Symmetry: C5
Subunit: 375 residues, 5 copies
């Protein structure tokens, strides 16, 4: 994930242009090899036309160039790229929104499951660890960085996500499918055991816990679905064929023909097709947006930082359910205890943001006494 | 389902280019018959023009070809194709999102329904089997592969989705509609009997069970809806006529005329219309996207693996409610029992992914002491 | 509703082409009258130009034809048709998704409301009949087929959706608005009476019943909303003006001029403007998609079968709450009672769909022993 | 709101063309002033060019017209208008979907809150009046028609939405913000008091009541959000600049030049630029769609009838919670008491809609005997 | 936030035209620096072409101008601009929808948590203050204005959002990540203690409280998500290069060439490229839409008033849970106590809006007696 949110907070003078001086997660990084190949092919064709063809062969090449340039169309490639990239971006943000965060569940585990002794602490840690284990199982199923971090379940055992007893239980329950769903059944059974043991005082709390757990399960299932059900290969190939046919046609039709031939549109040989190269920039960078975002769990610069998410979830969950259980700050009256209208101060750098409230768009409507009387 | 998610994990040099070498679920596999018909018709017309027409007939055909190639641009084949394919893809992903997964329900059945004896085990298995039976009943109605697997309800009995008593009950209750809804009423009544029998301790657990069951019911109803309410035939016909008329026109207008006639754009006889073939691949593959995805429950390569989903759901549900009921790993202190800041290790192949925490975009804003004062 | 889902299950050779031989719900059925009018006008103009115009008048008409052809543009009509038809299709599917199905509610009524005697059976039937009555009350207000089936509330009484007592109560509660909301308040009060009478054992079951009932209420309110709040008339008129002005100017600009005058683009004098007729096909069929789908409760072929939905809902609801209440099949051990990994058989026609499980995209990642070691 | 749903129920011959004969909510009504101004400017420029310019000035104006005709492009204006109008229509329908309807809440108040005496009736009426008061408080802030109906809170007192005690309480709770949220806190506290007083039998009914109330609160907050957070002014100005610059350059570039000069495309002086006027109607009507729908709570013909919604909500809510509380029709066996398969009759005008059930697309799949045996 | 909702209530004559006379949040305010740079470069190039080139170089510049004017159409600025700006606007409204509002939670805290004494009042205030501290903790992380208001957690202590005990507790629990999630765990534990202490009468009310709190948690997490996961930089750079290359090309190709050369399309020297300037306004304002909306928590005119939202949420929440707890207006019969059909009056300015009810589109369908009878 490349974050530039701070750099585009305000629409200043050339705010987006200053982003052109970036390299990580940039279009140059994703485009330099393709552009070098295209440049080499274009100039090889140019040198063949100039220094390797006879006059009749050059005339044939010029007719071919005009014929090709009559075929280079902007609307179809732009439309297919726009629709495909919109689909890819929608799926990319949906895949992000299905990344499981145990924060609601860890709050409910810290609150509902009672006991400051070793048994209650162990129970809360085990529940939140089941949640984190399910999350890390689906993430190592779908993310290449997480899989490189945990190539096997024994790596999960050595990393503390899974105890050896849990690993043996998972091996005993082995089915010819992905077994990421198991910790959710473990969570349900352990929560039922906790309620029957008195650690959960009411079944309302048990229902809330299992509702948050099922929400996490649905998110992990959506992650598995997006990893499994790819965008259909035919649509990807359609967009690739559109872009590649466009620039294969440009490889010949955008050649600078001999200016002495007085061909319309070929009155100035600039050697470098700056507009064709700009088109390559735009269209193949539009394609590279989709190429980078089609699997946002790879190892691109703009791909999701799933290992950081895993570590943060584990640390925050364990802290919330173990150290922060019934460990509250002292409850004391606040600054506005006797003030019916609080007014927090503004700094010197923020005093310009103290704005009057919006009372509705109809507040300033002016009416006379005659028209404000009820009929 | 053709999965290539691993091949496109990173945006490498020609990551989408290597996908053009695939055959299953590809443009070529979906397109070779149409392309062969187009090729044969194109070259039949070419040989008729060049070897079977008189000079006046050749001149008439040349004028017709120029007219067709002039008016080929009148056919909108990118707007309607784009919007129609977007609609088809949206509906295809919605149809996937309504595939029922009993995982939440199987967790709730494994937990809430108590009893390690034969009666409680039978009750849990019967409830989860009602869920799976409803799912398979809607899938054999919406999917051709599942129907080929279960042509009759007796096939469902012989496959273990239905008992003979359930089949007799379904035959007795028969109405002149699709009866996929029956196992949901069965689940509701069996769960009510379980709660009244003490197997479910509180009615809130019963409410949660029936909420998950109703979620599965809504998903199956949406599957039936997508199978029933097709995309309007007029829109499909518009797109189909657009594409096929474009290429029926290209059959004549993209012919290479006589180079001796010195027609503008026809001075060279290239024999093979390479750009017309690339346009054919692009446009008719764009149509084939919609053709393959309009019914994602058929037998295409990129259609849903519904038989696998059925088998996996049955196995996982039965295991979760039967073997995994109150069967937990031993609860022991973890690796970070006395570590307030856990830090799982990184491998040598993953040490580069250890990133610092993102603390918000405003973290690095620098303010002097004068402007930081209230 | 015209269903062709079985015909397009697989992307076979010309799967969409076999859909061109259909008449019900087809483009020809929606287009033949407009196309006949357009063709008649086009050939009237052609005969006037060819047989009833002087040479100076013919030259004037040729200039006018060239001018009109120069002013025929495809970009704006295509854009407005795409956006408008996308809006219409989205609204059409949302209108379908708001069709109330009582299946969840009928399951809850069959389960929660206890009693195998006449009183409990009557209570369950009355509750599910209130649900069906609300659905039919909104449907006869939004659907012309249902209104033709039930032109009056007395027709609903004669059809069994309303008892005479319910009709008298509805007439007593008459307000100058649509009274489709009344059965929901009836359902709430009858469910409260059932819970107070002991027929509903716990108030949480009552809450679930009223939640499903409120979901049906929201769906019926959305149906009323879509019937009431039409797509703005200005947008519809804009699209209609675009399409009809396009083809009014094609009526003159697409005329075949005299090839003897050697006009650019008029070298070949056909009689049938095949490309103009194809454009009429595409654009007026695109418009007819919106014309058919703008009110999906009319009597078009592709409109919703709301009478069938009403009949099916009534039958299924009454069967579920009356005959299926506590009427379960005998609970016996299944085929896989002691089999830990069930393997349902495949037929000969389905053996090719037996697939290995997808274990995640990272399953086949290969790493060496050195790089799989924790640092 | 202009409703034409009944007129477009079926896709008949010229279904959308008959909607061009409308005046209320029409494109003509929204466009006639702008079109008159454009007509006047165009013909003033024409008369200046033809009667008030010297021959050299006429040649300069002809060159300027030929220069202007090149800068008249359709793709950008169509693209921006399509996207902007799609955004406006999406926001318009979302603003409709956040119009609060108390039907679910009024059903729950009629059911859960018990008591046929004066205290229970007063409690139910006051609760539903709090709901309606919150709705009207947000509506008079976001809608100009409601504000013209209730210019002040005293107008709400005189209209029965607010009692004098409630008005004094609202004056006491005055903060420098919009106070539409106050009736929700009132509802929560009064419902808590009702549960403590025995009028609500179980806390789960109280939870359902407050859930419906919070749904109404979220809808009203979304209404306030849409009234406050407008579409960004830069985007509205971008679309306005595109449209009006297009037609400002059409004022000169679409002038009919002198036919004697035989300019390309100017061989015919038709006086009236019919196609330019059609483009004006189409594009500025596309803009007027956004202009009308950008604030759907104004006083346009297609804007929401919020005063009717207010009146209907008040009447229906008071009737549902007061007169319809525990006032049910007599519970008697229906028409299909012992009939297992109900079959309501069809009229002579609806008998053609009796359709056989759709059993799934795979019902008609034919397989021979050999391919049905399990392997 | 620039609000012009009142000005566009009705589609009057030139309703959008009057919006062009605005300055705050306008095209001009976001555009004038780039437009001045473009003007300067355009006229520098014009003066170089006219007064600083020889004839053999003027011919080359004229050929280059004709070439650029011919090939300016190759830049697909409209397509990528439209798709990118649509994405930015969708994300902008989604970012708005995840701004947390404590109104549902403050209603539940005011109702469920009982006690008019000091302990119950303190408990309600502390719970609602935990919700508002979580909101302000995420907002000072995602919004630059809120961060300028609260550069440190000590500023939150001095502003009343956080007590010194809460600040010490937050420092004790410190983790290397952002700690906006802590007040949610505090709320859960304090609500559990309140239920165990009898201040919450039933666990159903506790579940409702924690449901509203978790909804606020999800909204704040989505705010953090949008602040973290930016729109991919490659797409942004594509759009930026499209616009900037289009106008760098227009710098040369839109030059008014010498009319003595009688070039087609360059026979009239207007000096000022009015249509090129209109294209600049349109295209770069379309870009500035995305530039302003890509981070809606900055300090632009149309960015969200997050400081006002923070202050309003704090004031309204504290008032709702403290002063308004069990403080109800006197319950008395209303105006329509014995009126079966309530009819609120209309003013003279609103009597035109008294409209009849819509009974359904099928109400006016006319059928004769023969076709209305049920088929036997
Ligand atoms: Ca990637
Ligand atoms: Ca298929
Ligand atoms: Ca219709
Ligand atoms: Ca308006
Ligand atoms: Ca900003």
């Amino acid at each position: 994930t490349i974050t530039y949110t701070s750099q585009v907070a305000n629409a200043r003078l050339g705010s987006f242009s200053r982003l052109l001086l970036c390299w990580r997660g940039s279009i140059y990084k994703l485009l330099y090899g393709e552009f070098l190949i295209f440049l080499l092919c274009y100039y090889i064709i140019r040198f063949i036309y100039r220094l390797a063809l006879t006059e009749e062969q050059q005339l044939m090449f010029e007719k071919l160039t005009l014929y090709c340039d009559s075929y280079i169309q902007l609307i179809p490639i732009s439309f297919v790229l726009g629709f495909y990239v919109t689909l890819v971006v929608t799926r990319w943000w949906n895949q992000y929104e299905n990344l499981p965060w145990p924060d609601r569940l860890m709050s409910l585990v810290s609150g509902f499951v009672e006991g400051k002794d070793e048994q209650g602490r162990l129970l809360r840690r085990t529940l939140i660890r089941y949640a984190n284990l399910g999350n890390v199982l689906i993430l190592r199923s779908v993310s290449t960085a997480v899989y490189k971090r945990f190539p096997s379940a024994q790596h999960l055992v050595q990393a503390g996500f899974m105890t050896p007893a849990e690993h043996k239980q998972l091996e005993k329950l082995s089915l010819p499918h992905n077994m990421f769903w198991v910790p959710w059944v473990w969570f349900a059974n352990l929560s039922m055991k906790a309620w029957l043991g008195g650690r959960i005082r009411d079944p309302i709390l048990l229902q809330s816990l299992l509702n948050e757990m099922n929400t996490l399960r649905t998110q992990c299932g959506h992650l598995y679905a997006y990893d499994w059900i790819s965008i259909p290969l035919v649509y990807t190939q359609v967009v690739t064929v559109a872009v590649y046919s466009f620039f294969l046609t440009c490889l010949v039709g955008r050649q600078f023909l001999n200016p002495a031939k007085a061909y319309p549109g070929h009155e100035l040989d600039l050697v470098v097709p700056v507009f064709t190269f700009l088109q390559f920039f735009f269209y193949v960078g539009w394609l590279k947006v989709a190429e980078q975002l089609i699997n946002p769990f790879g190892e691109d610069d703009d791909d999701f930082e799933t290992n950081w998410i895993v570590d943060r979830n584990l640390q925050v969950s364990l802290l919330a359910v173990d150290e922060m259980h019934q460990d509250l700050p002292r409850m004391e009256p606040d600054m506005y205890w006797n003030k019916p209208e609080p007014q927090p101060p503004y700094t010197a750098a923020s005093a310009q943001f103290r704005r009057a409230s919006f009372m509705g768009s109809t507040f300033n409507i002016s009416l006379n006494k005659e028209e404000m009387e009820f009929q």
